[PDB]
C-alpha cells in the first residue's frame, strides 16, 4: 500500500523513513530506499554489501571512510579487495600486518617507497633488513646520521661500508677534534679489519648462499614458500 | 640493546629479551623476535591475540602446519574468504657468515 505512496516520497522523507526502517530493523529494505551518502554509508557498515558499499564509496572521498570501511572489510575477511582499499587508502600500518603475516617483496617494494615516506628512521630499516638489503639500511642511516649504528651493520653482515663509513664518521669526530675523539685505523693497527680475519665476508659460504637465497630451507610447509633462520642455518653458516 | 643483538650475528639475548617483553604484553611487537629467526613461539601467543586462524595459517603453512590454523577455523564457523597479495616473498638474510665480523665487542683506539 505504502509502495504506492512511495512516489509519492523524496528526498529527505526516505531518509527519515529509512531511520525508521532501521528501527524496524529491516536493514536491507533499509537499504532499498537508502538515501545520502553519509546514510548509506553507515548503514552500509551495518550491512556489508561490499562491494556496493565500494560504489557508493565510488571513490570514496575520505581515507577515513577507507580506515573505517577497512576494519570493516577487515572483518568480513574481504582483504584482496581490502588491500585494494587500504592500499587506495595507502594506509600502511594495519595493511603491513596482513602483508607480513603472509609476508611479501612485492609489498616490500611499494611499501619500500612508502617507507621512504613515513618520516622516523626505524620502521624503513626493518624493511631493509626484512628485504634482505644492507645497502638499502646502510643508504637510510645516511640521511639520518645513525652513524655509530650504521657502522655495526656496516660491519656485522659486511658489506665493508665500515671501511668507508668510519672514516666518515671518525670525521664528524674529527670535526669535534681530540685525537681520543679523531679514533683511527682499518687493516691494521687500531683495527685490523681483513688482518683479523673472522665473521662477516668470505666467498665459499656465500656461493652456497647465494643458492641458498634462492631456494626454501624446507621442513615442511605451503605455497607459502619456506627460509627457517635457527640453529641449523648457524652450523652451515659457519662452515 | 635488542637491536644491538640482532645485528650482531648471534641468536639468544634477544630471545630471552623477546620473553621478558612478550610477556609484559603486546600486539604490535612480535615482529621484533620473528624475522632473524625462522621458528617462532610467538604464535602459540598471537593466536590467542588474534584468533581467527587467520594469523594462524598465515604465519602457520610453512613449517608444514597450516592445519592446526584450519582445525579452529573450522571449529568457529570460518570466515576466511577472500586475501591479499601475500605469500612469502621478502628476504630476511643477512649477517656474519666467516671471515669480517660480527661485532659483540669493538676495538678501536685513541690513534
Redesign the interface.
Known amino acids: 500500500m505504502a509502495d504506492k505512496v512511495l512516489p509519492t516520497i523524496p528526498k529527505e522523507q526516505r531518509t527519515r523513513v529509512a531511520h525508521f526502517l532501521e528501527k524496524q530493523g529491516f536493514k536491507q529494505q533499509a537499504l532499498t530506499v537508502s538515501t545520502d551518502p553519509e546514510h548509506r554509508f553507515e548503514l552500509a557498515l551495518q550491512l556489508g554489501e561490499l562491494k556496493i558499499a565500494y560504489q557508493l564509496a565510488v571513490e570514496a572521498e575520505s581515507e577515513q571512510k577507507w580506515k573505517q570501511l577497512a576494519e570493516l572489510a577487515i572483518s568480513?575477511?574481504?582483504?584482496?579487495?581490502?588491500?585494494?582499499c587500504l592500499h587506495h587508502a595507502q594506509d600502511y600500518g594495519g595493511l603491513l600486518?596482513?602483508?607480513?603475516?603472509?609476508?611479501?617483496?612485492?609489498?616490500?617494494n611499494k611499501l619500500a617507497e612508502g617507507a621512504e615516506r613515513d618520516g622516523k628512521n626505524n620502521v624503513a630499516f626493518?624493511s631493509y633488513?626484512?628485504?634482505?638489503?644492507?645497502d638499502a639500511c646502510l643508504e637510510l642511516l645516511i640521511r639520518t646520521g645513525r652513524l655509530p649504528?650504521a657502522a655495526?651493520?656496516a660491519?656485522?653482515?659486511?658489506p665493508?661500508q665500515v671501511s668507508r663509513v668510519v672514516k666518515l664518521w671518525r670525521e664528524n669526530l674529527s670535526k669535534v677534534n681530540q685525537?681520543?675523539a679523531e679514533?683511527?685505523?682499518d687493516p691494521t693497527?687500531?683495527?685490523n679489519?681483513?688482518p683479523?680475519?673472522?665473521?662477516?665476508?668470505?666467498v665459499e659460504?656465500?656461493v652456497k648462499?647465494t643458492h641458498?637465497?634462492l631456494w626454501p630451507?624446507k621442513?615442511?610447509?605451503?605455497?607459502?614458500?619456506?627460509?627457517?633462520?635457527?640453529v641449523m642455518?648457524?652450523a652451515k653458516?659457519?662452515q | 640493546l635488542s637491536f644491538?643483538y640482532l645485528?650482531?650475528?648471534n641468536?639468544e639475548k634477544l630471545r630471552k629479551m623477546m620473553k621478558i617483553a612478550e610477556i609484559r604484553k603486546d600486539m604490535?611487537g612480535h615482529?621484533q623476535n620473528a624475522?632473524?629467526?625462522?621458528?617462532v613461539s610467538e604464535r602459540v601467543r598471537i593466536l590467542k591475540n588474534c584468533g581467527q586462524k587467520?594469523?594462524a595459517y598465515?604465519?602457520?603453512?610453512?613449517?608444514?602446519?597450516?592445519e592446526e590454523a584450519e582445525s579452529l577455523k573450522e571449529t568457529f564457523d570460518p570466515?576466511?574468504?577472500?586475501?591479499?597479495?601475500?605469500?612469502?616473498?621478502?628476504?630476511?638474510?643477512?649477517?656474519?657468515?666467516?671471515?669480517?665480523?660480527?661485532?659483540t665487542n669493538?676495538?678501536?683506539?685513541?690513534?
Open positions: 568480513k575477511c574481504q582483504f584482496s579487495l581490502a588491500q585494494e600486518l596482513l602483508a607480513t603475516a603472509s609476508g611479501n617483496a612485492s609489498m616490500v626493518m633488513f626484512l628485504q634482505g638489503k644492507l649504528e655495526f651493520l660491519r656485522t653482515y659486511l665493508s685525537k681520543a679514533s683511527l685505523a693497527e687500531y683495527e679489519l681483513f683479523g680475519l673472522k665473521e662477516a665476508f668470505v659460504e656465500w648462499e641458498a637465497d630451507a621442513q615442511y610447509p605451503l605455497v607459502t614458500p619456506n627460509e627457517e633462520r635457527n642455518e648457524e653458516g659457519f | 644491538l645485528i650482531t650475528g641468536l604490535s615482529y624475522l632473524y629467526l625462522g621458528d587467520s594469523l598465515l604465519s602457520a603453512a610453512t613449517h608444514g602446519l597450516d570466515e576466511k574468504e577472500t586475501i591479499p597479495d601475500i605469500d612469502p616473498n621478502a628476504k630476511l638474510l643477512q649477517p656474519p657468515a666467516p671471515i669480517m665480523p660480527l661485532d669493538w676495538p678501536l683506539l685513541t690513534v
